[PDB]
Amino acid sequence: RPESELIRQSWRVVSRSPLEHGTVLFARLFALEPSLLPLFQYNGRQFSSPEDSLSSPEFLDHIRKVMLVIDAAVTNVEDLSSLEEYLTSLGRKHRAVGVRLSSFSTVGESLLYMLEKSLGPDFTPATRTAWSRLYGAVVQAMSRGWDG
Ligand code: HEM
Ligand SMILES: [Ar]
Ligand SMILES: [Ar]
Ligand SMILES: [Ar]
Ligand SMILES: [Ar]
Ligand SMILES: [Ar]
Ligand SMILES: [Ar]
Ligand SMILES: [Ar]
Ligand SMILES: [Ar]
Ligand SMILES: [Ar]
Ligand SMILES: [Ar]
Ligand SMILES: [Ar]
Ligand SMILES: [Ar]
Ligand SMILES: [Cl-]
């Protein structure tokens, strides 16, 4: 398709520095939905503030994990059924830790935000539409993990 190369092309520069870029996504995510912060409980303890999360190795390791799942979705953009299985399980786990399926709309806007900010003029409405569709495919697959 042409959408696939829009995604592949947009992801290139972001994918080279995954923690720097994922740190934008999370900072935006906590700015939109502060109530996500307490859901990371490493040694059953809660982050008081967003800048607290950024000092946590485990938290930063979760940013890399997110970005690796996105790298998988970009990799397999033309055949996503393969990931469907993993993604339902991923969804299950995120129900187990306290994530409300509604919070993933905030995730999508954070991912668009981060991409818009690294691409500037290159993130065209077509690029936005391409990502919104891929992210949608991801979220359908993970939401099976709440039930469906
Ligand atoms: C509101 C958004 C999210 C919250 C609060 C959240 C929270 C968590 C928590 C608490 C864990 C277990 C602790 C840890 O491994 O670091 C986890 C694991 C994970 N998260 Fe997230 N998460 C969210 C979104 C995402 C998204 C969007 C992705 C991927 C696209 C993702 C990928 C993962 C992965 C890969 C793991 C490892 C699970 C496993 O295989 O054990 N997370 N997340
Ligand atoms: Ar991320
Ligand atoms: Ar953050
Ligand atoms: Ar991962
Ligand atoms: Ar993955
Ligand atoms: Ar994703
Ligand atoms: Ar999880
Ligand atoms: Ar996320
Ligand atoms: Ar994401
Ligand atoms: Ar998205
Ligand atoms: Ar995605
Ligand atoms: Ar997917
Ligand atoms: Ar997602
Ligand atoms: Cl490259």
Curated annotation (Swiss-Prot):
GO cellular component: cytosol; mitochondrial matrix
Main location: cytoplasm
GO biological process: cellular response to hypoxia; oxygen transport
Amino acids binding heme b: H62, H94
SUPFAM superfamilies named in the record: Globin-like
Alphabetical UniProt keywords: Cytoplasm, Disulfide bond, Heme, Iron, Metal-binding, Mitochondrion, Oxidoreductase, Phosphoprotein
Signals that turn on the gene: Up-regulated upon oxygen-glucose deprivation.
The protein's assembly and partners: Monomer. Homodimer and homotetramer; disulfide-linked. Mainly monomeric but also detected as part of homodimers and homotetramers. Interacts with 14-3-3 proteins; regulates the phosphorylation of NGB. Could interact (ferrous form) with G-alpha(i) proteins (GTP-bound form).
Protein name (database record): Neuroglobin
Organism: Mus musculus
